[PDB]
Each structure stands twice: as structure tokens, then as C-alpha cells.
Paper text:
Choline-O-sulfatase (COSe; EC 3.1.6.6) is a member of the alkaline phosphatase (AP) superfamily, and its natural function is to hydrolyze choline-O-sulfate into choline and sulfate. Choline-O-sulfatase (COSe; EC 3.1.6.6) is responsible for the first step of this pathway, consisting of the breakdown of COS into choline. This enzyme belongs to the S1 family of sulfatases (subfamily 12) according to the SulfAtlas database. Like other arylsulfatases and phosphonate monoester hydrolases, SmeCOse is a mononuclear metalloenzyme. DLS experiments performed at pH 8.0 show a single peak in the particle-size distribution by intensity, with a hydrodynamic radius of 5.7 ± 2.1 nm, which corresponds to a globular protein size of 200 kDa, also supporting a tetrameric quaternary arrangement.
The COSe from S. meliloti CECT4857 used in this work presents a single L105F mutation with respect to that protein (Genbank Accession No. QAT12853). WT SmeCOSe crystals alone or co-crystallized with choline were grown in 1.0 M Li2SO4, 0.1 M Tris pH 7.0, whereas the HEPES-bound C54S SmeCOSe structure was obtained from crystals obtained using 1.5 M Li2SO4, 0.1 M HEPES pH 7.5; they belonged to space group C121. The largest shift of Tyr123 occurs in the HEPES-bound structure and might be attributed to the bulkier piperazine ring compared with the methyl groups of choline. Lys102 is also displaced, but only in the HEPES-bound C54S structure.
Numbering used by the authors:
A (entry chain A): 2 to 514
B (entry chain B): 4 to 515
C (entry chain C): 4 to 514
D (entry chain D): 4 to 512
Write the structure that this text describes.
């Protein structure tokens, strides 16, 4: 029975989850997300499943780990037969739509979404394929580099602001269109994903929002740059992949990058308020669950690192909030995962556990919201640029454990060491630290065959090097999504009942005052 | 110096009808003429007796268990290299006119250009369900209505399709010939993939009239009663709804007659393509390959269509002619799996570049007289199976295994009609040793329990996704050819001083 | 021709729970049935979010600044006319069963008869002091111990009280029906004033079990940290000793579950009253009014109880059914101040008789489709205030002023949970013009310096007087219902022949 | 070590009869012996010439305009502090035997215990109406029938009342004496408030016979005819319905004779209280205050009763005797407004605890030789007024104002009988300057138009309320004294061997 709630998923890109200690941090100018946070169940220790765009987003859609989706990097094909939350909801009777980006690679640019309002900002082809056969070599034309840090600043239009302006406009327009069915008893409930590209770099913001942070006290990272020689091996691979030696990052560069990033959160907050105002005025808010989420974090100069690709807090933590009918507001400290979003959504929509159990590696967060302890650990994977073999991580209780066949292990006690400055795998405090390291090693072997993981990643890369080079010979066939809204069926046309058209398009109906 | 490549593919052509080129009784002058100048692989097999699995496997030179295209509704991943990718990577312009039954949103799988849509769906509709053994889906399963409905018409769904496939292929050849005189041209590879002689068995009168005196309108083995059929054959008859059709001897003769007529319909189209190649002066530089995806039992044993490993269903013709190809008849068993490595080899691509991507072998050494020893493998995991089946063809033997069924072993030299199952009725110790050798070879190649679990998981995925995709507004995956009218023929942004010259070929007396 | 009037009043009922009658999720069949035949005032506000100021203002139809009942220990002058006086003057028998939190020696204030004592004290104990801003008083201030102590019990102080209130109210209706056949009978007005769902949040198991599957056991806005609270909310949070209590999520759920249970408890008593009216054949001649004195935040924003102008605290239900009342839902804001002139109007009293004595307006024109334009006014001047607060509700707007605090402006159609203070954070030019207009409206209704000086003098008087009165033998003011035993039932001075007939009703019937 | 306080209050006693204690011609041996040991305030005034306004003002030490008790039916709010409150706060036991004419449901106003009900109503019955000037309410207004009905009787409504008032007040002193030998005993303050010599002018024959040859049975200023009266006096004459009585010279003499007799009746009762204090050994530790609510014209000028600011109506006696009180006569005008701050001063209460609550001053400084300069203010806003009246008494002067009447100014030294109105015809520039001085002082003290509006609002409220309150079953506010018999005398839950000793006092051989 369709007493089912509507679902508005607001997503943003590259949002460091530590900036949401309990809703947005006090220092951020974000009135609309703070007001949303007060009505929300808030998951303080929520993690991405993979600190990179396409792997995190394919994993997010399916509620499955990259090792199961096979979307290892930003150029890996996402099979159209993999069930996503759009399939699960659509099968249960929802209209499903996406406005904005999801970095799906391959010719399927919908993956269950019934309608998609924008193209993607990023490529949909196999261009950005890493190569495990050439460790230490970087592809300068698509790899991250620190020019974002040295080029931060102020502008009134950017590639990303043109995208997000449009993402927001078409999202609010779709809500307005949906509200015209509000009185139809046979209406399908709806689930709209609004997926913004900010605050992803470039770190460039409109002057109105940049000015908000003139007096900002958080423009210096809380852990300074660690010299290359003192970095752990993965961090060294990242600084090399970012071409760090060819940039002189000053203190001012760091301050301007962080200022523009905070400004772009404030830019998004204005868009969040627009969406909620639309919901309020179309009389749809009380029946609508609102979920706020992100794909991965951004180190923001902490430890001298920028962007993502690692499991340190700033990169792996992303915010997660849920508000609406039946959701108790509150703060939750138990680690949760992006992998839990899809089963959480299925549960909120009234779908049985048995229908989604075969298709997800996460757990519904609804029992948490209703006072049931969650015990499952949080699992993460990374297998893209700046790795030479896959890395996996486990987050459970107060611990984070990181393994890569090529590197010394890492173990962090986040209650005693929230900034992850003391590796206990190498400097154990006592026998408990050693017993803990042993138990995580066994957990690691219970979840991953790291040799098979490496081999599968190498085969996936190898396929695409053959295929992508072929596809770039001769005439190119693009896979980018092209939204179509048929002009011949919109607004007023002479095959329609014109004395009924205006009433159909009007909502609310029959009112004055 | 790289040759052009024309691939002529037909659908559902029983390979037993090409004993040495087309059988004598077929009216097929153009294919018999092409055969005389071809290397002919008399004992060539499909890799899977079903359209999409055979075609995905044909395109990749990989077995269905590797492509994952188990049935007619299984997604074919776009990251899987095909002979299109391999040729295109080597510098070929590649194009497809006709069908390939690709399932999923990629309708090119490496082809640079595709001139027609597919005749069949590109979505997950036709998914079998191993969880419901014994039922059928009436709205897409085969049924014997094609046998009782055979006859004569001047247009059909398939004749509209194939008429269009032919026109656009000859037009593309004409278009390509305009680049003949430019030394920096790319060589081209054009696949022309017709839907005939696949059923419905309905032919144009012109071609139905050619077989009025035909002496092959009776199958060579008669209908085997259901109680005497091996279990898989029983499953095929149930899936075809055999009990609700009263197939008469006249139904059988008419179906076979129209089927032979449609081969002659195709033969005319082969002559058109050869004629285009001749008059455009590209024939001498063009390799010509003739192939099919699977066969058709055509009433033999009482069976119709495909879905099994018997000769009529699993045999398909294969020939290659052109520059550097010595003609002759080859008898060692070969596979559609070999087509992709054979193409790459003919195009000068190194064996090492294709080795990691193909389970077949190049046939070019065979064309040049080299003995072959590699066996021929086949798989089936779609409708009328309740669990996967596999077959091995080696020397004179064929072995067929399904976990649920008695094994089958045939000696095709002593028993070309596979009337004696030597697994059940061995002639002596050598047949017993042979069975054991094939058992061991099967176990080293397939884990049939892992195979069955992979097929089940693939079916279950699609049951969830397809039901969702059929809710709300449908988003189609069918390929839409686009030829930009604003850039064709005469337009006022173009150099009209040079347009006519560039579109004229050959450029003889009067041309610039 | 004058109709009977039954006023059903409950205590601390959050008006947001009555969007259109009781909300669907409440188990309240009797109040849902009453609502369906009622004029229902969706946006009805208390005039002061505290028990005694709200109740004295309700009785008089006058704001606290006029009644002088500023807090829960402020004397209510017996010379102030109430709806009981107005009706009694027009020929009504008037009676109260239940509480009214009247402070001072007059415990009737016009009621001709009162069937129970009060549940609360009648003296000057609970007196605030503006000369000591920042202190709290633990032996009478609200504290969060009600939240941590919520649960289930088969008797409580409040359930003993309300069981008696209900029994005597139904008994009185039965007594009154014996005069139905007399043409010269006075019409009656009976006020039944229950103490639930006021805390303690403790309910009978039977009603507790109704809400096991409830989806509203948590509030729509969570606890806002002290540092982010507006200053009045901060004063309140200190006032309930919020830091001395560890309020778990389960405490929140148990508290709201028992509160909902006690509404269902009340719903059963509403049905008994209606059933008595039905069987005595007085239903068709009786106006029924359902009301409350103030709301309860119930954990929203982290706040419990009242003392503020936020919706959960200031909104209270108001419903009217009966002869001459067209049913319907009304969204224009209305006020408890309006009940007294509404009642007098329904009783045939002229507007001129009541105009000099009321700050509200009759709602009868609303019921009959006539637009109401007067704003809704509210005041607070008790504990957790350091100076009086006033509020104005008009159109979609709510404006709150206190001379010690930043102003608050809410657009309730855009922001029904009041999460954006538009005085600090206007959305545009119209928010600003609207702020200026409310400031002008405020200066037109209130002299805030005179308000504060009158509150301070009243507090100081009582501090001198109460100290004295708690020395020596105490003289209590609690109402004691009259004793009539020698004139009740069968006594040998009466006529034992007509006695049974007089006490019987209906009379001379069979079937 | 705080003293006991006995307040003896009488009703309607003309203060001019106490020129230095009681006048010689009165038979009042006990009040004269008391006067001799008393500080005596010869020129003491009521704050309002009417029962309930005077008594509410007496208790609060606040003017009627501040108490809001404007007339004999105006509610007295229980939140207004009274001298009972102040003394109770300071550790005193406080009690009242007799009348106080408190209107409203509070019949204690801080008294811890009250031994009798009131002789007068406690409800809003006697409410005037400024909207109907010139009319009168015959069922409770004063009328001259008291003057024509004067005589002799052995029991009256008032003698029954005052006999019981006296008996319960002496019993209470006995009960209090049992606590004498207890160190932790609270000090006590007992107010004994008699209804005499208020009219009816009817006395017991014993006391009536004491004035056979009395030489003061003729008023010192005869009747003034209506058309020669000041307009307020005219309003009073109509309110008493004067033209419906033939008041003879005999009626005047009879009324004044019965009035003087009832002073003697009261004097006997004062002797009883004093004797009870003496024999219980509480006397030396007890302050004794003698006072009255308002006066009585007693025929002077042809007027009777009160309601005006003339000397006979506005003067009331005031005396204080006891520990720490130097005897002597004081001539500076004082006011009933001063009793409450005087009591609080005598009880050791600091001046700051009481100053925000009183419009009067402590008289203890005068008793001890400190000159007092504050003026004496009075107000009247009840029957026979159509708008409020105020008066200022300072030095030798009395100024009387009502917006609707000509002003009155009197020099009481040159003109003790108030026969020459210096506002209408002054003696010279000094008189004129004086009138101007008072006009300005009055304007600084009262807005008379705000006064009139508050009186009207109070009347209007009560007209709505009192009508309702008199429909249906009536709920009375009259005080019912408490007396648990189950806890009195000898009961079988107490220690009987111990009961007799604790109820016995003094406790010697
Ligand atoms: Ca991204
Ligand atoms: Ca096919
Ligand atoms: Ca209350």
C-alpha cells in the first residue's frame, strides 16, 4: 500500500565528514543544513566505501563494495544488470529520478533511474584507467595535481557552478511538476536524487560566499604537512601522483583553498534551502524523507595531503543525515557506511529485508535510529590511481585498520588518537594493541582474498586498455547522457484539451485567500 | 597492404547443408562460386546453439562461460574486446549492417558504425529461470507454429529487415570505394549479418518455386516419440509446446521448402555484394568470410530449431576466400571461436596481442595445410536446459555432458546421424576408455556446479532489474542509426566545385 | 431557549496534536467524533503559557496584564467578572468540577457551585522575583524528573483527581436532568476541568498499551544545545535544572508515550460525558466546548512543558459543537481570550454587556463565515522571565518581544517549526517591513515599562505577605465542597411519596 | 524581649471628646487612668470618614487611593500588607476579637486568628454609583431614624456583639498568660475592636443614668439650613433623607446622651482588659493603643455620622501607653496612617522593611521629643459624594477639595469650629498665599480626574459581579471562628495529670 513516503536524496561531492561533527560545524555558514540537522538522525562516524568518485558512487547506488560491483576506479564499467536503490524503489512502485552527477561509466547512464534530468559533468568512457603494470608513473592529463591548491580563488561562473546551478534548477522544477499529482489517489510516490559537484575542487567560489569567511578561524589544517621522507608509503604514492614537487604550496594557497571550499559549502546551503522551500510550498514536505550524503571526503591540506584516495579521516569520513516521518532526531557515534544507504532506503520504503539481502553488503540504519545497537564493522576498499595493489580497511568500535600487501599495516585508536598520528601496528602500546592487530588481520582474511582482488583489478585495467584505444580510433561514439524533454508535448499544443491544460498544470488547485 | 574484410553472416543455417560449399540440391549459384575459391571448414561448430550466446561468443572469440552471455537476455559487457576492437585498434574502419543480438545498452561493442537497428530486443526480457524447471514462456519461447505456418509471402518482418541490411551494405561498399585511390585510406571490415534463413519459414514465391521438385523435403531421421527421446530432447519438445501442434508430413515439407528457398533468397544477396565488390575494383583486395550463428534441426529426429548439440543444430558453415587464401576442403573440426583470432591473424595482428582475449585458434595455418589438434568446445545454458550442458568435439567423437542427464558419446565416422549413444551402448573397451578420457577432459575444463551457480545468479539479477525497468516510462536500448542529413549530398557550406569529383568512382575519363 | 453549555477543559494539551480534531495517530474516538460535528479552530493560542495566568485570563477573557494574575501565585481579585458571572447574571446555573488554579481566598469567582477542591495550592507559594534574576526554586519549579520518571501505574495523584472530577461531573449532569421537565428550570453551564495530560507522564497500562507501535514517540526537532538556544529558552533550560538530569532517548519515548496514553485516558471520559448527555436527552440542547490552558513542548527543541511562545507550548485546541454551530475547520489564528465573549454571545448576551470586560472577540461570526481580523495576543511574566515577554500572532506571522532579548519573527507557513528567526535573519525586504510593522503593533498594545513595574510591585507585595502567612497556625484557602448529608437521599422531614418521583428521570416511561 | 501589643479600637468616636484623654464630663475612669500614662495625640485624624475605607487604611497604613477600598463594599485584596503581616513576620502571634469591616473573601488579612465574626457584611452589597448622583439606597444608607429612635435597652444587636467581643478578648488574654513562664513563647498582639459607640444610639439603663445632669447634650454649632450648607454637607443631608424626619431638640439630647452612655459602656470593658492584664502579670510588658476608625458629628452643624472632613467626623482619638512610652500630650496633627508604621517601629522592625508599604510615619520619634512635620492627608469617595474629595491638614490649617465644589480652607487655631471658610473670603494676602500653597500641594499629591476614573471602574466591576453573586445559591464570606471541641478541655488522648498544671496560671503554691 502506497502510504509510502517520498524520498529526497541530497548528495554533494568531496565533503570532508569531519566538518559535520553534529550537523554542520559551528564555523560554517550553513543555516539551512543546520536546521535540517536538528530534525535528522545524524551519523557522526559515517564512512565512504571507497575514497574516489566512481567507485564510491557505484558502491553507493548498489550498496555493494567496489570488489563486488567491479567498479574499481574512475574508468571501470558499471554493469547495467547490477541492482541499485533506483531499481529496488522503482520495483516497489516509486517514480525515480536523478538531477546531477553520479559518475557512472559505461553506456548505461541511468542504472535504474526512470528519468535523468542532466548529463554528467564527468566522462562516461574508459579514459581514466590506471595501470598496475606501470607503478610510479602518473597520467598527467587526468590525475589530480596541486594546481587546484595554487589556483584557488573567486569567480562568478565556473564549470562546476554552471553544472550545479542547472542541477538545482531542474531539481526544483521536477518537484514543482511532481506536486501536480499530489491530489491523485493513484499517484506513485517519488524519489529524487539531487547530486551536486561542489565542494569538489577547483576551489573557486562566488564572491558573495567567499566574503562569508573573511574572519574564518579554520583556514589552517590541524596537522601540518609531513615531509615526504616521514610519510607512510601510500601517502608518498599520493604526493607523487599529485606531482607535488612541481608546486610551491604556500600558507596563503592553503588558506585560499580552504576558504573557497567553505564558501562552496555555503553556496550549496543556499541550494538546500531552495529545495526545502519548494517542498514546503508544494505541500510535500511532511510526507518526504530527506537524506544528506556525500561520495568521499577531502583532506584539505591535513598532513600535507589534498583530495581523497586514502582512508585517513578527512578523506574517508562523509556526512550522513536522515530526516522525515518516523525518523527520530539524534546523534549517532557508532561507525556507519555509505553501503548502508541503499538498504536503509529500501527499509524506509517498506521493502522486505529478504528482497534486498541478496543484493547488498550493508545494513539498514533504521534499527539504529530506533535504539538497536549496530555491531557490523565498516569496510572500505581502494584500488585506483596512487595504489599499486588494492588497499582495504576495517572500521569497528574505536579502531581503524588498513592493509595493503605492499605496505606496513596501520592501526589507529580514534578515541585516544582522533588525528591518527600514532600507528599502533608499528608502535603498539601493550599486549592489547597486539591482540587487536591480530583480530583485525583475521577479520581481513575473513572478508578479502587480496591476491584475487589484485588479479581482478589488473584484468579489468587490461581489458580497457585494449578496448579504449580502439574506441578512440575513427569516429567516436559518445556515451554521455542526453536528457530529452519533448518540446512537441510540453506547454500548450493544439492536440491537447486546452480548457483542461491550465487546470492540470496548476497546483494547488481551486484556491485563493 | 592490409586487406579489406567482408564478413557475410546468416542466421540459423544448418552446417550439414554445406558439405563442400552449398549442397548440390540447393539453388545457390553465388555461394557455390564463392565456395570454389574458398577454404571450406566442413566440420565447423557453433560455440553455443542459441543466437545471443553464439554471437557474443563469435564477436569475442570467447566461450559463453567467459563472456557471461548465457542466454538471449544476458548483458554483454562493453569492456570485452571483440574482433571489431582488435581490427579497429589495428587501423581498420569497422561497420555492421544487420543483426548481432547484443543485449544491453552497448549496441556497437567496438563497431565504429552500425547501419541498421537490430531485429531483436536489446533488453533483459527473454531471461530463463532455472528456479522453475519444466515451464515455458509462451510469448517468446519457440513453438512449432512456425512448422505449421510455413508458406509463401512477398514481404515478412525478416525480408523487410534483410532487404534493408543488403541495400545498406552495398551502399556502404559503394561509399567506401570512393576512398580507393587515396593511399592514406583505412582498410575496412564490413559485417553483413542477415536474419534468414531463421524462421518463420516463409519465402518469396520466386524462391519457393525453385524447390518444387526438391528431393530433400523429408528429414533423414524421423520423429522420435517423446517416450524414447533423451531427456534434453524431451525438454526441447515440451518447451516448443509440441503436444499442442499436430505437425503433418506436409507441414514438414513446406517448412523445409521455404527454408531452402530462403537460402536462395540469401544467395541472390550474396551475388549483389560480390557484384558491388567487382565493379568497385575492391574484390581482389577483400577477404570474404561466410558464417552463421547456429543451425536448425529442420525436423530431423522430430526436432526443430536449435538449443542442442546434435549435428543439425550445432554445425554451421564457415568459409574464407580472398588474397592469400588457398582454396580447399578441410575436415578437422573447427569452431566459431576461431573466427576472431583468424581475423586478427589475417589482418597482421600479432598472436600475442589477441592470445589473452580468445579461447580459439587461428585457422590460417590450416588454410596453409597445417594439421590441427585443438578440440572444439560448446556450451548451452538457456531455455529448455535446467542446468548447463557442455560438449567436446575431437577427432571423430562428440561427448555431451549435463549433470542431470545420461551422458552422450557419438562416433561421427561410424554414426554420422548420432543414432547410437556409445556412453549407454559401448561397442567395446575402446569406447569405454574413450568415455573415461572425455570425462577427465570435461572435469579439467568445467566445474559444472560453479557453472550452474553463475547462470542462476545472472538470471536472478535480471529478474530484479528487468521488473523495475518495465515499471514507469521505458528507456529503450535499441540502436538508432543516424546519418546526418545536413552533411549529406549537396549543401551550401561545401566546396561544390569538388563535391561531384569526390563522390564519383572510379574516376575515369572526364574526372578531375 | 438558552442552550446548556458543557465546557470540557484539559491541562497542558499541545495544540499541534489537534490539526483537525485529534491527530490520526492518537487513539481518541470520542474526541474525533466530537470534532467531526464541531467548529474547529486549528490555530488557537493560549493567552499565557502557564497554568494560573492562562486560567484567570480564560475565565475573564482578559490578558494577564489586565487580570494582574502574572504567575502561579498571583491573587485573582474576586471583583473581576468571569464567564461564570456573565452567564449567572443572564439566568444560568454555573458549576465547576475540577481545577482552575485560582489563587487567593476566592475559589469560585462567579461559579455558583464547585464540586471538587483544586489539585494545586491556593496560596502565594510559587512567587517569582525579578530582583533575583538567574535563581531557580527547586521545591516548586518544573524539573526534568518527570521526563526521566515516566512510565506506567494504575493510580496516581492526577488519576485519583481526574477520576473524581469525571464522576462528579457525570453525577451533576444526572442531577440536572431531573429538572428537564420544568419549564421554569435555569439553563446550566458545567465546566469539567481535568488535570491530565499535564505531567507526571504516568498512565494506566490499558492506555499505555495503545501506543506500543506509535511513530510519534520522538519530537520532530531534537535537543538544541544550550549555547545555540535563544535567551529565553536558555533561561528555561536552567529553570528545569536541565544539567542535573541525564535525559535518554528512551526517557523521551516513555514520556511522550504516557502523555499520548493520558489523552486516550481523557478520551474515555469525554465519551462518558457525551453518553450521559445522550441518555438524559440533553445532548441536542447543549453546547460542547473543548479547550486547554497551555501546551507542552514534549521534548521538541530539547524543551519540556511550557513557559514559552513556541507552537508546542502556546498552541492549545479549541472546538465548539452544538445547536447553532456549523461544523468546519478554521485556520485564522484565535485565542483563549475569545472563549468568554464567544460563550456570552451564544447565550444571547448583548455585545455591549460584555465589551467593557473582555480583550477578546466572539468567534460566532467566524463560525458563520465572517472573516476575523483581530491579531492574537499573548503575554508571559513568570518564572524563567526576567522581564515580561509579549507576542503577537497574525496572518502567517508570529512576533515575540522582550526588552532584554533579541526579537523573534517567524513565518509559520514557510517555517512551521520556527527554526529561522527572521528578525535576525530576514529573507528579504518584506521580512524587514513586517518586523517594523509588528514593532508598531506592539507599542499600540503594551507599555512594556509599565508592565514590568506592575509585575515587580505585585511580586514584592506577595513576598512580604507570604512570609508572614507561613508563620504560626496556617489558614488554608483550599475549596471544600459543601456538605449536604442531612438534606440528601431519604430523610424523615421530606415527603417520602414525591421523593422517589422527584429523583427519577426520565419520568413515567416503560417499553 | 519584644513587648506584647493590645490595640483597643472603638467605632465612630468623635476625637474632639478626647482633648487630653477623655473629656472631664464623661464617666470614663479607666480610659482616663490609661490616658494619664499614655502619649496622647490630640489632633489625630482618620484617613477616610467611613468604616471600611478607614479600617482598610488603618490596617495597611495606606490611603484609600492606594488600598483601593473606596467605600463600604470595595474588595480589600489579600495581597496588601497589614500591621498584622508585619508583626507576624517579626515573630508575633496576632489575633483580632471584634469588627474590622473587611470586604471580600479574606476575613483575616494577616491576622493569625480571629475570635468573632464581623457584625457587618463581607460582600459587595453597599456599593455606590457615581453614574446616578443624587439618588440614595434606603436599605443601607444612614438615615436620621437613629436620632429619633435613641433610648434605653438592656440588649441590642451591638451590645450582644461587644459583650462577646470583650469576653473572648479577656479569655484570650488568660489563654495567653499560660505561656508566660515559657521562654520560647511568641510575643502577642491582640486587637479588640468594638462596635460602640456607633449608632443605634441605645444604651443600657445603668450607663444612661450616668448622664442625667449631663451639660453637653446640646451641639456647639446648631443646625445649618439646607440652602446655607456647603454643597457636600447638602449631599450628606439628602443621603440621610433629612426631610423625612422631624428631629426635635429632645431627639438630639437623647442621641448624645445614649452616645455618651455607650462610651461609659466601653470604659467598663477597658477596665476589664486592664484588670485581666494586671492579674495575669502581663501588664508591664504590654503596649496599649486606643484608637477609632472615624468620628461622629453628633448633631454639630445639624449633621450626624461621618462622611465629611469636619472636625467632629474626621478627628479620632489616639493614645499609646506602655514599656518605653513617655506620657504626654501632643498637638501636632497625626493620622491613623501612622498607626501601622508606629506599631512596626515599637516591635523592633527596621524602618526600611516597612517604608515601601505605608503612606504614614512612625510616631515613636514624637513620643521621644522629635518634631514631626509631615502633613495629614484624607480622602473620601463613597456615598453622598459624586466625585472624590481630599483634604490636607498641616499646622493650623485644613484644606478641602472636590472638583465639583467650592474649596474650603480653615484656620483651626483662630477658628476651631470651622465657621469661616477662608477660601471664599480670606483675611488678607497670607490667607491667599496659603490657599495657593495648598492648591499646589494637592495637585502634587492627587490627580483628581484619575482618582474619579478609578472609583468609577471599581463601582462598575462590582455592579456586574454582585448581581451575578446574588443569583442562585449564595456563598457567604463571613468569618466562622474555629473551635475544635475534640481538642479542648479534658480528652482521653492527652496526659490528664499534666493537663491541669498547663492550664493553671500563675503556677505557685
Ligand atoms: Ca567525485
Ligand atoms: Ca538467432
Ligand atoms: Ca496547567
Amino acid at each position: 500500500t502506497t502510504g509510502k513516503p517520498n524520498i529526497l536524496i541530497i548528495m554533494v561531492d568531496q565533503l570532508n565528514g569531519k566538518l559535520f561533527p553534529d550537523g554542520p560545524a559551528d564555523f560554517l555558514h550553513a543555516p539551512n543544513l543546520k536546521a535540517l540537522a536538528k530534525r535528522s538522525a545524524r551519523f557522526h562516524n559515517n564512512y565512504t566505501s571507497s575514497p574516489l568518485s566512481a567507485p564510491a558512487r557505484a558502491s553507493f547506488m548498489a550498496g555493494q563494495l567496489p570488489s563486488r560491483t567491479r567498479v574499481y576506479d574512475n574508468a571501470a564499467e558499471y554493469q547495467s544488470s547490477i541492482p541499485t536503490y533506483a531499481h529496488h524503489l522503482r520495483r516497489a512502485g516509486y517514480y525515480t529520478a536523478l538531477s546531477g552527477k553520479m559518475h557512472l561509466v559505461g553506456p548505461d547512464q541511468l542504472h535504474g533511474f526512470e528519468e535523468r534530468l542532466t548529463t554528467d559533468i564527468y566522462p562516461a568512457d574508459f579514459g581514466w584507467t590506471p595501470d598496475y603494470r606501470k607503478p610510479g608513473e602518473r597520467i598527467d592529463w587526468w590525475y589530480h595535481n596541486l594546481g587546484s591548491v595554487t589556483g584557488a580563488g573567486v569567480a562568478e561562473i565556473t564549470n562546476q557552478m554552471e553544472y550545479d546551478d542547472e542541477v538545482a534548477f531542474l531539481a526544483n522544477q521536477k518537484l514543482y511538476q511532481l506536486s501536480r499529482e499530489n491530489d491523485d489517489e493513484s499517484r506513485r510516490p517519488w524519489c529524487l536524487t539531487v547530486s551536486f559537484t561542489h565542494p569538489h575542487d577547483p576551489y573557486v567560489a562566488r564572491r558573495k560566499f567567499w566574503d562569508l569567511y573573511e574572519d574564518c578561524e579554520h583556514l589552517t589544517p590541524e596537522v601540518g604537512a609531513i615531509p615526504l621522507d616521514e610519510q607512510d608509503p601510500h601517502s608518498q604514492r599520493i604526493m607523487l601522483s599529485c606531482d607535488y614537487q612541481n608546486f610551491d604550496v604556500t600558507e596563503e594557497n592553503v588558506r585560499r583553498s580552504r576558504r573557497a571550499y567553505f564558501a562552496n559549502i555555503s553556496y550549496l546551503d543556499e541550494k538546500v534551502g531552495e529545495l526545502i522551500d519548494t517542498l514546503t510550498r508544494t505541500r510535500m514536505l511532511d510526507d518526504t524523507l530527506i537524506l544528506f550524503c556525500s561520495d568521499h571526503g577531502d583532506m584539505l591540506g591535513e598532513r600535507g595531503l589534498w583530495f581523497k584516495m586514502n582512508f585517513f579521516e578527512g578523506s574517508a569520513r562523509v556526512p550522513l543525515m536522515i530526516a522525515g516521518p518516523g525518523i527520530a532526531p539524534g546523534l549517532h557515534l557508532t561507525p556507519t557506511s555509505n553501503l548502508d544507504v541503499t538498504p536503509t532506503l529500501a527499509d524506509l520504503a517498506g521493502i522486505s529485508l529478504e528482497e534486498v539481502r541478496p543484493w547488498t553488503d550493508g545494513v539498514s540504519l533504521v534499527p539504529m535510529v530506533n535504539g538497536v545497537e549496530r555491531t557490523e564493522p565498516v569496510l572500505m576498499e581502494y584500488a585506483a590511481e596512487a595504489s599499486y595493489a588494492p588497499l582495504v580497511a576495517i572500521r569497528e568500535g574505536k579502531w581503524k585498520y588498513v592493509y595493503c600487501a605492499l605496505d606496513p599495516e596501520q592501526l589507529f585508536d580514534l578515541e585516544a588518537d582522533p588525528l591518527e598520528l600514532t600507528n599502533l601496528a608499528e608502535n603498539p602500546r601493550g599486549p592489547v594493541d597486539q591482540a587487536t592487530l591480530t583480530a583485525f588481520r583475521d577479520m581481513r582474511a575473513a572478508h578479502w582474498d587480496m591476491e584475487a582482488f589484485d588479479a581482478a583489478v589488473r584484468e579489468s585495467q587490461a581489458r580497457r586498455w585494449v578496448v579504449y584505444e580502439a574506441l578512440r580510433n575513427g569516429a567516436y561514439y559518445p556515451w554521455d547522457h542526453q536528457p530529452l524533454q519533448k518540446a512537441s508535448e510540453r506547454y500548450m499544443r493544439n492536440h491537447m484539451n486546452l480548457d483542461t491544460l491550465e487546470e492540470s498544470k496548476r497546483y494547488p488547485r481551486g484556491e485563493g485567500s
